[PDB]
């Protein structure tokens, strides 16, 4: 608001900004012997008493202007004070009205109060972290320097319009300032468009603006610098302030202050139910068959392909564990972003050189110079499809990562920096699982999501040893106990059905693994609102080794590659009956009536020997969600 009191001794000059209610205090300087007052104003202004009225402090007077001023002091308001003694006293007030409007994409539409509220009925604009490189001759993220090097970069910013409508000689006695609070001055940068030079950044908290009189519009471009984290909730305030500088001896006086609130776009992942767009892989040695199978699967699925040759590969074939692809979106642009794990094996150059580029951001967190564990591999990093739990909706799913049940002396955990970053990204509130028992410790080794036409749309697949044991019991009691597992593989010993069925240590180990799987299944059923109809069991066998950790007895068939309605499942080399393996037949009969095609790829000698599967060695980029994140209420 604006409070201007009138004094009969001398006339008063004041500025009334259009869009702001201005109340007149009419008792501060009122004549002592006075009893009543009257108001007469010019037609250009509207006066509301909320003929003669008493001067009691309760009553109030509001003034509203309709059009911008063409000249200084072009409206006049007169107040006649009526007293029982002496003639009435006249007081004068001169009004000049300006129009100062700082506007952004507050409606989240794409065209250009003062608070950011989630939900479809909310208001507040969105910034995008300029984490890409639109310059083809640069070797730095374009938000590191203080210049705009190419007009295409302008598309990754946010627009802000300053509309000014003032008289011609207005700004000879007034000044405009743009600023951001000192705690957020190091997480934002603002350029002025005329081609563009910096205005606000990590070294200039505030800048004075040069604006001419009359009508004018100014264009500002805003770019964020840091993703939201524990120390930075994500709200950035930009403030426009009008200062009076009439007298040179005196300092400036603030007379009007408007502001806008921006939210930094969070990092949003993509689950397995989204259509693919691009597939990454690796080539190291004896990989012609594996790469050929991946290529034909990609061709069938109608997507791209990117392959790293061995020169830059450095004998590292686990693309999944190093990088994870998500997206960041805003009403005017949606661009993917690669997340680089603190793990720095031979593939530390691929995500930093061959991935990030034009319209491909890059962000990473944690300590890079060692001090991590296997749980930091992106194996413990999955997302469930949109879910509804006990009346609360998550249209963007929930992050899932595994760690130890309780802290101890030999327990491991995901790095705290990564955990806090994921938690700070609210839109997918993370959920913890118990996956420390695995030797590598990857939640990708026991859970998987598949798109389904019916019911909720998805179907979680979990590894369960009982399923394999019942299949083997059937194979034995129909009389084919002579079947040899690992027949195709020559180097590894073939095992007959009776021996594996009568083994006792293996049964005990699989009972322990089943108990862990049951606990995780109950956790997921509680946290994702699942019934028993949305969970499918795929047979598998686990065996314990040094320090009692579980490893896949035969290739893990839960860690499969899903591309729309096509599946690349690791070949188990299970026992064959009537010229078809029982494991493959069972899994095909379990997944096909859902509307899928199953293709088994062999990676025993190239991946399984080094404790890996297909999905652990390939990565997929997926189309961003159609649902706008800002429309969800956390």
């Amino acid at each position: 608001g604006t409070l201007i009191r009138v004094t009969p001794e001398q006339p008063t000059h004041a500025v009334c900004v259009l869009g702001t209610l201005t109340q007149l205090d009419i008792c501060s300087s009122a004549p002592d012997d006075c009893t009543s007052f009257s108001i007469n104003a010019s037609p250009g202004v509207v006066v509301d008493i909320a003929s003669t009225w008493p001067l009691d402090p309760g009553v109030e007077v509001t003034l509203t202007m309709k059009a911008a001023s063409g000249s200084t002091g072009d409206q006049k308001v007169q107040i006649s004070y009526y007293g029982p003694k002496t003639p009435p006293v006249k007081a004068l007030l001169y009004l000049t009205a300006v129009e100062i409007s700082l506007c952004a994409d507050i409606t989240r539409t794409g065209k250009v109060q003062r608070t950011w509220t989630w939900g479809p009925c909310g208001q507040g604009a969105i910034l995008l972290v300029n984490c890409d490189r639109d310059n083809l001759e640069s070797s730095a993220m374009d938000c590191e320097d203080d210049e705009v090097l190419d007009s295409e970069d302008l598309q990754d910013m946010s627009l802000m319009t300053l509309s000014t409508k003032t008289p011609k000689d207005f700004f000879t006695n007034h000044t405009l300032v743009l600023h951001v609070a000192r705690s957020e001055m190091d997480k934002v940068r603002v350029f002025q468009a005329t081609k563009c030079s910096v205005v606000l950044g990590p070294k200039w908290p505030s800048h004075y603006l040069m604006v001419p009189g009359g009508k004018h519009n100014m264009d500002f471009y805003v770019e964020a610098l840091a993703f939201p984290d524990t120390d930075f909730p994500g709200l950035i305030t930009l403030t426009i302030s009008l200062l009076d500088t009439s007298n040179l001896e005196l300092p400036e006086a603030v007379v009007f202050q408007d502001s806008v609130v921006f939210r930094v776009a969070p990092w949003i992942m993509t689950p397995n139910t989204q259509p693919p767009q691009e597939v990454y892989a690796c080539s190291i040695f004896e990989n012609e068959d594996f790469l050929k199978s991946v290529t034909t699967l990609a061709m069938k699925a109608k997507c791209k392909l990117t392959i790293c040759p061995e020169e830059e590969n450095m004998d590292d074939q686990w693309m999944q564990d190093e990088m994870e692809i998500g997206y960041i979106q805003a009403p005017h642009k949606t661009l993917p972003v690669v997340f680089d794990s603190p793990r720095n094996r031979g593939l530390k150059e691929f995500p930093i050189k061959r991935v990030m580029g034009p319209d491909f951001g890059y962000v990473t967190r944690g300590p890079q110079t060692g001090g991590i564990s296997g749980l930091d591999s992106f194996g413990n990093l999955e997302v469930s499809p949109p879910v509804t739990v006990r009346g609360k909706e998550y249209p963007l799913g929930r992050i899932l990562f595994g760690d130890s049940c309780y802290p101890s002396n030999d327990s491991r955990q995901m790095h705290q920096a990564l955990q806090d970053f994921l938690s700070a990204q609210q839109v997918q509130a993370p959920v913890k699982l118990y996956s420390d028992w695995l030797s590598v410790g990857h939640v990708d080794e026991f859970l998987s999501f598949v798109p389904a036409p019916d019911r909720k749309g998805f179907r979680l697949l979990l590894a369960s040893p009982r399923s394999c044991y019942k299949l083997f019991q059937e194979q034995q009691n129909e009389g084919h106990g002579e079947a040899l597992l690992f027949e195709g593989i020559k180097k590894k010993k073939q095992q007959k059905i009776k021996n594996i069925l009568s083994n006792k240590t293996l049964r005990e180990h699989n009972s322990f693994v089943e108990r862990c799987i049951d606990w995780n299944r109950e956790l997921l059923k509680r946290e994702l609102g699942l019934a028993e109809s949305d969970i499918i069991d795929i047979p598998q066998l686990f065996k314990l080794k040094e320090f009692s950790k579980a490893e896949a007895f035969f290739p893990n068939m839960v860690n499969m590659l899903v591309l729309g309605k096509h599946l690349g499942i690791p070949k188990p080399f299970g026992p064959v009956i009537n010229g078809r393996c029982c494991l493959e037949e069972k899994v095909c009969s379990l997944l096909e009536p859902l509307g899928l095609q199953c293709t088994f790829i062999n990676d025993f000698f190239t991946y399984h020997i080094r404790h890996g599967e297909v999905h652990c060695g390939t990565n997929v980029r997926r189309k961003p969600f159609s649902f706008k994140w800002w429309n969800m209420v956390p």
Binding site: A140, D186, L225, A226, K348, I352, R365, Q368, T369
Partner: peptide
């Protein structure tokens, strides 16, 4: 911030 992470990774 994120630029500093970029430079540190490229150095390694």
């Amino acid at each position: 911030y994120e630029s500093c992470r970029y430079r540190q990774v490229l150095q390694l």
